[PDB]
Swiss-Prot record, chain A:
Domain writeup: Contains an N-terminal domain with structural similarity to ARM repeat regions; this domain functions as a scaffold for protein-protein interactions, but is not required for RNA binding or for ATP-dependent RNA helicase activity.
Family: Belongs to the CWF11 family.
Function: Involved in pre-mRNA splicing as component of the spliceosome. Intron-binding spliceosomal protein required to link pre-mRNA splicing and snoRNP (small nucleolar ribonucleoprotein) biogenesis. Plays a key role in position-dependent assembly of intron-encoded box C/D small snoRNP, splicing being required for snoRNP assembly. May act by helping the folding of the snoRNA sequence. Binds to intron of pre-mRNAs in a sequence-independent manner, contacting the region between snoRNA and the branchpoint of introns (40 nucleotides upstream of the branchpoint) during the late stages of splicing.
Record protein name field: RNA helicase aquarius
Encoding gene, per UniProt annotation: AQR
Annotated positions binding ATP: Q178, Q183, G203, T204, G205, K206, T207, D208
Protein origin, superkingdom: Eukaryota
Modified residues (N6-acetyllysine): K423
Source organism of this protein record: Homo sapiens (Human)
Localization: Nucleus; Nucleus, Nucleoplasm
Subunit description: Identified in the spliceosome C complex. Component of the XAB2 complex, a multimeric protein complex composed of XAB2, PRPF19, AQR, ZNF830, ISY1, and PPIE. Identified in a pentameric intron-binding (IB) complex composed of AQR, XAB2, ISY1, ZNF830 and PPIE that is incorporated into the spliceosome as a preassembled complex. The IB complex does not contain PRPF19. Within the spliceosome, interacts with SNRPA1, SF3B1, SF3B3, SF3A1 and SF3A2.
UniProtKB/Swiss-Prot annotation, chain B:
Positions of transmembrane segments: none
Domain of life: Eukaryota
Record's protein name: Pre-mRNA-splicing factor SYF1
Function (record text): Involved in pre-mRNA splicing as component of the spliceosome. Involved in transcription-coupled repair (TCR), transcription and pre-mRNA splicing.
Cleaved signal peptide residues: none
Entire protein: shown range: 33 to 285 of 855
HAT repeats by residue range: 16-48, 58-90, 92-126, 128-160, 166-188, 193-226
Localization per Swiss-Prot or TrEMBL: Nucleus
Assembly with partners or alone: Associates with RNA polymerase II, the TCR-specific proteins CKN1/CSA and ERCC6/CSB, and XPA. Identified in the spliceosome C complex. Component of the XAB2 complex, a multimeric protein complex composed of XAB2, PRPF19, AQR, ZNF830, ISY1, and PPIE. Identified in a pentameric intron-binding (IB) complex composed of AQR, XAB2, ISY1, ZNF830 and PPIE that is incorporated into the spliceosome as a preassembled complex. The IB complex does not contain PRPF19.
Length: 461, 243
């Protein structure tokens, strides 16, 4: 009996209980999903006596697992070909890793763990670090790091995360903790196809490894989904607290729970609070696109919504942007400053973004500002679902199934609410999980049925 | 401010026609766009004049002429963009498709829908990435329940059954049902004779659309000449006798 509270003056369970007249208590509780399901089975199918209604007394200090077993067993149970064998032990157990799934990332984003290329040159102690170009005033990038399949060179090439406009506020977030060498190898063995169990000794930052994995997977796959699963709420709370310093938009973050839980980190990831915050962010995007419309200088006395905002973006901003494109890629440092009608738009921004000296730098600035207005229209594309979903829980599910690529879930909670997740968008292309030994074999295999096969094959990577 | 003198400076502009187009766009977007027909015939005559030269600066000046003639937006700048689309359909480079589709769907009308969707059709030829990608983005793009239907009927003609079934799924999730039936029959032609695809397509089609025993008995003859002889076939034919 997971008790919510006792009887009051108005017969309702507690949530300052009222004037407790007398020494009786009549309290309602709800232990689990399948709480009134085992007695239902006994009264309906086996026709045996009553367990939940034969009551005698109460004393203080499961069937959800059995229903999950029944479902997973009587479905196709098509598991990932690299993990079903590693779960039944048959097959060489060095196989579920990266070095025995064939499709290793040719060159992945090893961005976060390294913030100095000399640091990465140390943290690659057994590979010949082939860094492309030789200016150390030019090499500390989110480099591309190919490890080949001679055959042991760390092929690091520079990269430049593209602009986002004039503003120095969105300076794209890079990590700060220089995780270990085998820890970066943990991140890589997780972000490449296979399986990975990190042996995290006390204090080593298994949760830092998890935050690194979240970041690197959001980098090397913008579209595939991440189920970050825990044994207790500590993992999800701490990993959210840590990823609060990474390059994630809050339209890509969501979670599950086991019922009632109070937000343990700074900002809410929860259902109603998240829909409300995204409604406020939608107001932000609407006012942004609208002041951009006034920057374009059209007439009109009433304001528009998400659909008209997206169509109007593609109709006006994209048209002007194609004009500037056919002026710039057809192109002086004068026209890279002038020929952008974003002067009225970045006229609420720092001093002109096309510096008027380096045509290519002015081009980066102009395309970054246009792509920023396109990210305004893109968060408008995301708020399409906020304006299409009717209820708070409805918009929670819609925004977690549609755009939120990072869903943090608890073990028994997701084992209890997996069916709803399967039906309304359980997308498990990648799993990142914490508190490994803090679960069981049951709480490790019951999540293995969050979906149905995809033409004879599972969703796992 | 006489459109006469404007067309006169355009059609008397000699030498390089680049000062022609620059001063033309300047003055034309300065004053009103009543010279629409003048600039249109001018663009066509200029195509007659320069279509033998490099397609870089003349076609650029023409696109500029059309987008600038589009004072705010109008019903003939999508038209001239469609003239450039049909003219560069013989591209050899898909940047023509990209830029022409941008220019023509610079609005959201019935215009350039049937210019982009057959452009995705002529994209699907030996590279299914643009086909299925435009299929997805259009199914999740400017809303019209007929566009995704047309998408299923387009992927019906190319050898990616997943794209047809994908548009079918999108429309059934949200003639169209009959067109989904036609695409189901197209992928149900007796090639995958494992006896799975045609039968499942029969069930899905007869689920979304109701035929009173017609397609039922079609699938009946199919699956009963494709059935077995053991308990499977005994039971299948008994169930068909009962249903």
């Amino acid at each position: 009996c997971e008790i919510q509270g006792m009887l009051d003056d108005k017969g309702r369970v507690i949530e300052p209980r009222p004037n407790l007249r007398g020494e009786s208590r009549t309290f309602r509780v709800f232990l689990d999903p399948n709480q009134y399901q085992q007695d239902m089975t006994n009264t309906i199918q086996n026709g045996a006596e009553d367990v939940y209604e034969t009551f005698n007394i109460i004393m203080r200090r499961f069937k959800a697992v059995l229903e999950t077993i029944r479902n997973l067993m009587n479905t196709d149970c098509v598991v990932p070909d690299w993990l079903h064998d590693i779960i039944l032990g048959y097959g060489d157990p060095s196989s579920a890793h990266y070095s025995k799934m064939p499709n290793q990332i040719a060159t992945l984003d090893f961005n976060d763990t390294f913030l100095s290329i000399e640091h990465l040159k140390a943290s690659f102690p057994g590979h010949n670090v082939k860094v492309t170009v030789e200016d150390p005033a030019l090499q500390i990038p989110p480099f591309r790091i190919t490890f080949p399949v001679e055959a042991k060179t760390l092929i690091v090439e520079p990269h430049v995360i593209p602009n986002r406009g004039p503003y120095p506020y969105n300076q794209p977030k890079r990590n700060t903790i220089q995780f270990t060498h085998t820890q970066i190898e943990a991140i890589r063995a997780g972000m490449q196809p296979g399986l990975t169990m990190v042996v995290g000794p006390p204090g080593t930052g298994k949760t830092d490894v998890a935050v690194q994995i979240i970041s690197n997977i959001y980098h090397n796959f913008p579209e595939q989904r991440t189920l970050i699963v825990t044994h207790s709420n500590q993992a999800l709370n701490q990993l959210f607290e840590k990823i609060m310093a990474l390059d994630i938009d809050e339209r890509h973050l969501l979670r599950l729970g086991h019922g009632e839980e109070e937000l343990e980190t700074e900002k809410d990831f929860s259902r109603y609070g998240r829909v409300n915050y995204v409604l406020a962010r939608r107001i932000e995007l609407l006012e942004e696109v609208k002041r951009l419309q006034k920057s374009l200088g059209v007439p009109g006395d009433a304001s528009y919504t998400c659909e008209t905002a997206g169509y109007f973006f593609l109709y006006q901003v994209m048209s002007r942007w194609e004009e500037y494109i056919s002026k710039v890629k057809n192109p002086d440092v004068t026209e890279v400053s002038t020929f952008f009608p974003f002067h009225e738009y970045f006229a609420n921004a720092p001093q002109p973004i096309f510096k008027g000296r380096s045509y290519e730098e002015d081009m980066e600035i102009a395309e970054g500002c246009f792509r920023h207005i396109k990210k305004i229209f893109t968060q408008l594309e995301e708020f399409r679902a906020s304006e299409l979903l009717r209820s708070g829980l409805d918009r929670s599910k819609y925004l977690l199934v549609k755009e939120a690529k990072i869903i943090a879930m608890t073990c028994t909670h997701a084992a209890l609410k997996r069916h709803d997740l399967v039906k309304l968008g359980f997308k498990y292309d990648n799993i990142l999980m914490e508190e490994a030994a803090q679960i069981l074999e049951i709480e490790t295999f019951i999540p293995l049925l969050l979906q149905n096969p995809q033409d004879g094959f599972s969703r796992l990577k | 401010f006489s459109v006469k003198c404007w067309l006169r400076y355009i059609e008397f502009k000699q030498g390089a026609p680049k000062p022609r187009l620059n001063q033309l766009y300047e003055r034309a977007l300065k004053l009103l766009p009543c010279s629409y027909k003048l600039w249109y015939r001018y663009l066509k005559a200029r195509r007659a004049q320069v279509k033998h030269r490099c397609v870089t600066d003349p076609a650029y000046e023409d696109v500029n002429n059309c987008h600038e003639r589009a004072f705010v937006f109008m019903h003939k700048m999508p038209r001239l963009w469609l003239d450039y689309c049909q003219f560069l359909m013989d591209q050899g480079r898909v940047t023509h498709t990209r830029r022409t589709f941008d220019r023509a769907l610079r609005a959201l009308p019935i215009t350039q829908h049937s210019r982009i969707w057959p452009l995705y059709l002529r994209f699907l030829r030996s590279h299914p990435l643009p086909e299925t990608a435009v299929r997805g983005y259009r199914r999740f793009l400017k809303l019209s329940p007929e566009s995704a239907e047309e998408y299923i009927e387009y992927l019906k003609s190319s050898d990616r059954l997943d794209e047809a079934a994908q548009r079918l799924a999108t429309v059934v999730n949200d003639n169209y049902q009959l067109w989904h039936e036609l695409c189901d029959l197209i992928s149900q032609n007796p090639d995958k004779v494992q006896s799975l695809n045609v039968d499942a397509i029969i069930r899905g089609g007869l689920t979304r659309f109701t035929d009173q025993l017609g397609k039922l008995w079609c699938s009946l003859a199919d699956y009963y000449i494709r059935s077995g002889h053991f308990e499977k076939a005994r039971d299948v034919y008994e169930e068909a006798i009962r249903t």
